[PDB]
């Protein structure tokens, strides 16, 4: 046909790409780091566009992970270090009324701390959780802080909230984010109801293990997502289509006192407890949870067999940070025992521990001291998904709560988004020639 090459600029095509995204949105996150969000939800549906997604090869997860860790470290860096408190403690039993489940959990410790002046010392009394102290043999002491033998303990800055707030990860111009608006989306493979957005809906950096809190719900049915469901070494992300409300509390009324440990420094500690001492706990409605697991096994049988028995069991062992359900509540860190939720074959109260000196990730060499919060803490949150691991062990599959790899927490979200690079240039044969 005597066709000629015609060059078109502004062609609606793209290629998969990895680029640097920026965030948009008294707090760890979105202090000054993030750009004010454009309030207009400029979402464009792409009719007849099928896009292949892979939530386990999504570089937005790696960027979200690095951004959260970086912001966490930036928040804690300009704060009071507790190296002057790495001294032996004289600890005795708490003299208040202790319930059966709190015997030895909390101890009344005393120590000689520094003051505003280098040449002075003060005797300080405080209540520490057993998890935060370890035995030591010394002259006039019994225990020392658990992290002083590993790394410096940094006190979190007071009045800087750890509450997760939605963060929007937005693409630079020349790039676009595609969303998969597909009900019951597998999390991998072609997605027909693709749409283009400038950026995400606002993802809360909620940190938890085993149970996914304050996330997004499935549009119609529970969705089982796994990189390779056959391989038991992979974690399974279960997105629920209904929330399960979990009510977590620390009923003790804490009286919080503070001391100076140097010029301009301050250390916060629990001074005493008002009322009886009770164990922290979470209440999960029994009927709702039973229906939730019924739905989960109903979905699992599609991959494991219509006639297979599915069993749930508690975690297999290891560090508290991964064997229990870790979460932030009111600024406090709860480590709840989930064996009451995953103990079955196909009101529930879960006891919880509180730990003030924590390692936020698997990395070793850093530690943070979470200051106590005055009063009584009660949180109401939605369980929106589960992290499950399949037992290696033949029939009757056994599932357990998963771990704390964090990427799983940031794959429950960001599984429907892909970043693509726009390629405005293209060529095509036309009948048009110069002159």
């Amino acid at each position: 046909e005597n066709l000629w090459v015609t060059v078109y600029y502004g062609v609606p095509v793209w290629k998969d790409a990895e680029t640097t995204l920026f965030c948009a949105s008294h707090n760890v996150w979105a202090t000054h780091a993030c750009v004010s969000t454009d309030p207009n939800p400029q979402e464009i549906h792409l009719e007849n566009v099928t896009e292949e997604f892979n939530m386990w090869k999504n570089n937005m997860v790696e960027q979200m992970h690095e951004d959260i860790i970086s912001l966490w470290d930036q928040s804690l860096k300009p704060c009071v270090k507790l190296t002057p408190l790495c001294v032996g403690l004289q600890c005795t039993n708490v003299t208040n009324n202790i319930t059966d489940d709190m015997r030895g959990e909390l101890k009344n410790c005393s120590f000689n701390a520094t003051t505003e002046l280098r040449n002075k010392r003060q005797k300080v009394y405080s209540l520490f959780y057993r998890l935060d102290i370890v035995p030591m043999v010394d002259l006039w002491t019994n225990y020392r802080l658990i992290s002083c033998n590993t790394s410096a303990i940094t006190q979190a800055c007071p009045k800087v909230s750890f509450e997760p707030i939605p963060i929007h990860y937005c693409a630079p111009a020349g790039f676009a984010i595609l969303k998969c608006k597909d009900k019951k989306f597998n999390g991998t493979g072609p997605c027909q109801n693709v749409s283009t957005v400038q950026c995400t809906h606002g993802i809360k950096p909620v940190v938890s293990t085993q149970l996914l809190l304050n996330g997004s719900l499935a549009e119609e049915e529970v969705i089982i997502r796994s990189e390779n469901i056959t391989n038991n070494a992979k974690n399974i992300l279960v997105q629920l289509n209904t929330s399960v409300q979990i009510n977590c509390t620390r009923p003790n009324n804490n009286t919080v006192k503070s001391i100076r440990i140097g010029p301009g420094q301050a250390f916060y500690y629990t001074g005493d407890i008002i009322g009886d001492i009770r164990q922290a706990h979470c209440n999960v409605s029994k009927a709702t949870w039973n229906e939730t697991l019924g739905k989960v096994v109903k979905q699992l049988r599609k991959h494991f067999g219509n006639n297979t028995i599915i069993r749930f069991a508690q975690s297999s062992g290891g560090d508290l940070e991964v064997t229990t359900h870790s979460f932030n509540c009111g600024g406090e860190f709860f480590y709840c025992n989930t064996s009451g939720l995953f103990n079955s074959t196909w009101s529930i109260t879960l006891p919880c521990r509180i730990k003030q000196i924590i390692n936020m990730w698997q990395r070793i060499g850093q530690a943070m001291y979470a200051p106590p919060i005055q009063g009584v803490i009660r949180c109401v949150s939605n369980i929106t998904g589960l992290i499950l691991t399949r037992d290696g062990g033949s029939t009757t599959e056994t599932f357990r709560p998963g771990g704390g790899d964090m990427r799983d927490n940031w794959r429950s979200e960001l599984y429907k988004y892909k970043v693509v690079k726009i390629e405005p240039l293209g060529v095509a044969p036309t009948r048009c020639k110069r002159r």
Binding site: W4, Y9, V13, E47, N48, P172, T196, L425
Partner: protein
């Protein structure tokens, strides 16, 4: 009227009428990540504009050239390419030949500029 990339699933013919809809969307310590992203957006825009300049297509969105289609890059007729295909499918179909086509376009302009210069040198 469909917005940025709204024509992505439409045929090449229909999509060719929305070039300006998305062309405007190519330009528009934590400071470094955002600043680098802005610089990269600028570098990609400028590389595409420079490439259009090399081909003699500066300032145009639909630029006709003097390079013939050789029927080996793709042997589809215009009816199938423009009425029964999208730009994503076309881009995939001739991806392996884009560097060849771009090279020919550069060579074509190099000859054309000399010809214009020679025509302009006649009194």
């Amino acid at each position: 009227s469909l917005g940025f990339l709204g024509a992505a699933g439409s045929t090449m013919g229909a999509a060719s009428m929305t070039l300006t809809v998305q062309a405007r969307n190519l330009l528009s310590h934590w400071g470094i990540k955002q600043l680098q992203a802005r610089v990269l957006a600028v570098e990609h825009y400028l590389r595409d504009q420079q490439l259009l300049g090399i081909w003699g297509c500066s300032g145009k969105l639909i630029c006709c050239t003097n390079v013939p289609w050789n029927s080996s890059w793709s042997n589809r007729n215009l009816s199938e390419i423009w009425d029964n295909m999208t730009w994503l499918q076309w881009d995939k179909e001739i991806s392996n030949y884009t560097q060849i086509i771009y090279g020919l376009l550069e060579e074509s302009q190099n000859q054309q500029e000399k010809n214009e210069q020679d025509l302009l040198a006649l009194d």
